[PDB]
From a paper:
Comparison of the four structures showed that they all adopted an evolutionarily conserved eukaryotic KH-domain architecture, consisting of a three-stranded β-sheet packed on one side by three helices.
In contrast to the upper part of the binding pocket, considerable variations of the amino acid compositions within α1 and the β2-β3 connecting loop led to the remarkably distinct properties of the nucleotide binding pocket at the lower half, which is responsible for interacting with ssDNA nucleobases. For instance, a longer loop together with the presence of small hydrophobic (A194 and A197) or polar residues (T385 and T388) in α1 of KH2 and 4, respectively, resulted in relatively open binding surface with strong positively-charged electrostatic potentials. Interestingly, the potential interactions of KH2 and 4 with ssDNA 5–8, which shared the presence of a triple-repeated deoxythymidine (TTT), was consistent with the previous suggestion on the preference of FUBP1 for T-enriched sequence. As expected, in contrast to the wild type, all mutants did not show a shift in migration on native gels upon incubation with the selected ssDNA. These overall results suggested therefore that all four KH motifs of FUBP1 interacted with c-Myc FUSE ssDNA independently and individually, and KH1 and 3 might exert potential preference for ‘TTTGTGTT’ sequence while KH2 and KH4 might have broader binding specificity.
Residue numbers in the entry: 184 to 222, 231 to 256
Write the structure that this text describes.
């Protein structure tokens, strides 16, 4: 069954996660093999295979650092 994990994204970083046209969040979904959607700091909801969600969490946190 899918894991669901939320990363809180500061408002100032939201555009960076999504990117122009959504091209950054599309790349992130392809590279990590999960679904990511946004829900003040905004939750990014990551859904997928439990192993892929853990890696995707690290990839997103590293990007927004």
């Amino acid at each position: 069954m899918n894991a669901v994990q939320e990363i809180m994204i500061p408002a100032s970083k939201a555009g960076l996660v999504i990117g122009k046209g959504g091209e950054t969040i599309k790349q992130l979904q392809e590279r990590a093999g999960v679904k990511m959607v946004m829900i003040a700091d905004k939750p990014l909801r990551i859904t997928g295979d439990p192993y892929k969600v853990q890696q995707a969490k690290e990839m997103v946190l590293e990007l927004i650092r």
